[PDB]
Amino acid sequence: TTPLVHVASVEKGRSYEDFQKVYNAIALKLREDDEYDNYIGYGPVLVRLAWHTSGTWDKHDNTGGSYGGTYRFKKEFNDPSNAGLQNGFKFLEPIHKEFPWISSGDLFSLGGVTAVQEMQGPKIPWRCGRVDTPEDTTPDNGRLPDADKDADYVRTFFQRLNMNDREVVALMGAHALGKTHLKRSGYEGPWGAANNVFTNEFYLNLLNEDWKLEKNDANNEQWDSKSGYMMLPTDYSLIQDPKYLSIVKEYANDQDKFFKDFSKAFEKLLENGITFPKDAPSPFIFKTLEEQGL
């Protein structure tokens, strides 16, 4: 069928102040619910939820993507690739209850932006206007990437999301956050030490740790260091491919450049598939709780 156009439609009468209140409620709950996942907190799972709800997009026919908020439907929430994201969704449930006017796509993507900023990451400009679409618009399972693959796979996979080498390497830096959980993905361990603070640690660890190719308890191969860190085969592919390797070295040597490129690629990922009218509001830059003295 003919590719649909998804036009951003501002939640009736809402403006920056309304969305800053939603950001604040998410940020305050991130601070309060600090026990989750052995005190990592919900920041990393909210970033992963924003990426997986956006990552289903197909540039060829504009199916999937963040616009429709379709993760709320069983086919997508039960995608094996989304195992564990129910924690991010449950976190956002009281937020949606307090702000019922926000669309599901706007909430999932805003959860990601809030988590990155609250974890001292870069500012991520964010635009409102995603509109909930019906159950039959839910994309099928299998549009999210496999972790047991090589650089050729990663590069080809991300062409579907209209991401180039620099955008892919910058986006993968989010693997500074959280960890792999054996029961969710068949991989186990964190990528680094500060896994609830957004830094360029992922690139420094790729380049500086002594990695060993081992089998985990799920019988899957992963790269492990004596420091207690791990890398997926797709992460390690970033230092196997010479084009990705040059970009990894750039981000490992320039925190500000990584922040600036991640911010652009992450906003692009969250906005793929959406048509913003010429007279839509400009993207919002939310203040963090710290900047507000809250």
Ligand code: HEM
């Ligand atoms: C080649 C592409 C990618 C692959 C194969 C991949 C794979 C995975 C895997 C297997 C996990 C562990 C899931 C679990 O066991 O809990 C994970 C976690 C995570 N992913 Fe990625 N990912 C990719 C790209 C990305 C991107 C583009 C982002 C965001 C920009 C992202 C953000 C995260 C975050 C924050 C976590 C930690 C979640 C948590 O701690 O609960 N990933 N990823």
